[PDB]
Design goal:
- It is classed as immune system.
- Keywords: Peptide complex, MHC, immune system.
- The assembly is trimeric.
- Structure of HLA-A2:01 with peptide Y9L.
- The complex is a heterotrimer.
- By secondary structure, chain A is mainly beta.
- In chain A, about 0% of the residues lie in helices and about 50% in strands.
- Chain A contains no helices and 9 strands.
- Chain A has strands at about 5-10, 20-30, 35-40, 45, 50, 55, 60-70, 80-85, 90-95.
- In chain A, strands 1, 2, 5, 6 and 7 form a 5-stranded antiparallel sheet that branches.
- Chain B is largely without helices or strands.
- In chain C, the strands form 3 sheets. In chain C, strands 4-3-2-1-5-6-7-8 form an 8-stranded antiparallel sheet.
- Chain C has 5 helices and 17 strands.
- Chain C has helices at about 50-55, 55-85, 140-150, 150-175, 175-180, and strands spanning about 5-10, 20-30, 30-35, 45, 95-105, 110-120, 120-125, 135, 185-195, 200-210, 215-220, 220-225, 230, 235, 240-250, 255-260, 270.
- Chain C folds into 2 domains: about 1-180, Murine Class I Major Histocompatibility Complex, H2-DB, Chain A, domain 1 (2-Layer Sandwich); about 180-270, Immunoglobulins (Immunoglobulin-like).
- Chain C is globular.
- The chains are: A mainly beta, B little secondary structure, C alpha+beta.
- The interface of A and C includes residues 12, 24, 26, 31 and 67 of A.
Chain lengths: ~100, ~10, ~270
């Protein structure tokens, strides 16, 4: 079985500048469980990145939340980069504010 | 509270 | 409504050196309350919710002892399954286990379950009668035969019907302020003009618990499912959940459409309009 991860990249709270927050990348629907997930600030990877304990759904596909604290501004772009066996190359999802 | 026994296959 | 306690277990073989990665988590409803990771330094079951710290060392040692027995069963299972399916020792494989009990609003036994998978496929599951098994293939039939001879099912029925629900009631009592409290969706609406002709409307539900939620769109009071998107409910990180839904509409026609939110923490379901 090989399942390709769905990905959402989002903030914990409605975002305002200068106002501290959490950036999330939720990966779900994947199999096997070996996976690389990196959050990016202006293309460069972020270091203080926590993630939840591995669990799975009714259909046996795994899911994980990666998160880190951050303060938005108008300049900084944020994204989630994901690699998994089912991908020919890393999948990058940009955080839009909606 | 986990099951007290996990019988192998 | 109802509640559940569920454990989820994953074991992953590492063929070149060492023993398998093993991760266990415990849930009451949508709230993780305990965990074990073979790669963590503690080598102990660990709390992940304030109301479980209430428990004494005896609890923690018992739970650590059981979780390591589970760990070993899975280690052994990976080897047994490798030989059942004639696989080589070059491959990484996965074993998954989920069991738990449900109770209804009266907190009395309702259901119990126990299911097991090998490389992400049904292997063997306990039936709802809690007295018989569903083996997906002939490997799992052999297991089914072993476990019928050994009355595993009866052991599990004792746990699921007895102990499992006793500890669930306890947990619901000791975690009263969160586990028995619902949080209503905080709802709002955004607009997005893609051209002069086409607008996108998005209905947001934020900061709600439990996860179960329904978001539907209507046009002139009738269910619309065309030109709509609905994302997977996602976790906020702070114990609560999020979900949005969108509809594409002709520009200037936004007033016809309504989003309809149903959640356990809402007495009357909500309606939003732009």
């Amino acid at each position: 079985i090989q399942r390709t991860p769905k990905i959402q990249v989002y903030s914990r709270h409605p975002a305002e500048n200068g106002k501290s927050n959490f950036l999330n990348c939720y990966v779900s629907g994947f199999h096997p469980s070996d996976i690389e997930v990196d959050l990016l600030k202006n293309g460069e990877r972020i270091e203080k990145v926590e993630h939840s304990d591995l669990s799975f759904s009714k259909d046996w596909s795994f899911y994980l939340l990666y998160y880190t604290e951050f303060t938005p501004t108008e300049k900084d772009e944020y994204a989630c980069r994901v690699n998994h066996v089912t991908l020919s190359q890393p999948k990058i999802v940009k955080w839009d504010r909606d | 509270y986990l099951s007290p026994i996990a019988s192998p296959l | 409504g109802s509640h559940s306690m569920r454990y989820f277990f994953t074991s992953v073989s590492r063929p070149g050196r060492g023993e398998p990665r093993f991760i266990a988590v415990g849930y009451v409803d949508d709230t993780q309350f305990v965990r074990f990771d073979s790669d963590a330094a503690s080598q102990r079951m660990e709390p992940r919710a304030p109301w479980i710290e209430q428990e004494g060392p005896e609890y923690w040692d018992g739970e650590t002892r059981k979780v390591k027995a589970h760990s070993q069963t899975h280690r052994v299972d990976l080897g047994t399954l490798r030989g059942y399916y004639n696989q080589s020792e070059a491959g990484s494989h996965t074993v998954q286990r989920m069991y738990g009990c449900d109770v209804g609003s009266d907190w009395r036994f309702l259901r119990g379950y126990h299911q097991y998978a090998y490389d992400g496929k049904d292997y063997i599951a306990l039936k709802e009668d809690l007295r018989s098994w569903t083996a997906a293939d002939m490997a799992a039939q052999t297991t089914k035969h072993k476990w019928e001879a050994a009355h595993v099912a009866e052991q599990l029925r004792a746990y699921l019907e007895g102990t499992c629900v006793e500890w669930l009631r306890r947990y619901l009592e000791n975690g009263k302020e969160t586990l028995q409290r619902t949080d209503a969706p905080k709802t709002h609406m955004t607009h997005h003009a893609v051209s002069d002709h086409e607008a996108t409307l998005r209905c947001w539900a934020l900061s709600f618990y439990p996860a179960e939620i329904t978001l539907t769109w209507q046009r002139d009071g009738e269910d619309q499912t065309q030109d709509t998107e609905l994302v997977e409910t996602r976790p906020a990180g702070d114990g609560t959940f999020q979900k949005w839904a969108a509809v594409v509409v002709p520009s200037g026609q936004e007033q016809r459409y309504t989003c309809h939110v149903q959640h356990e923490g809402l007495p009357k379901p909500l309606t939003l309009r732009w």
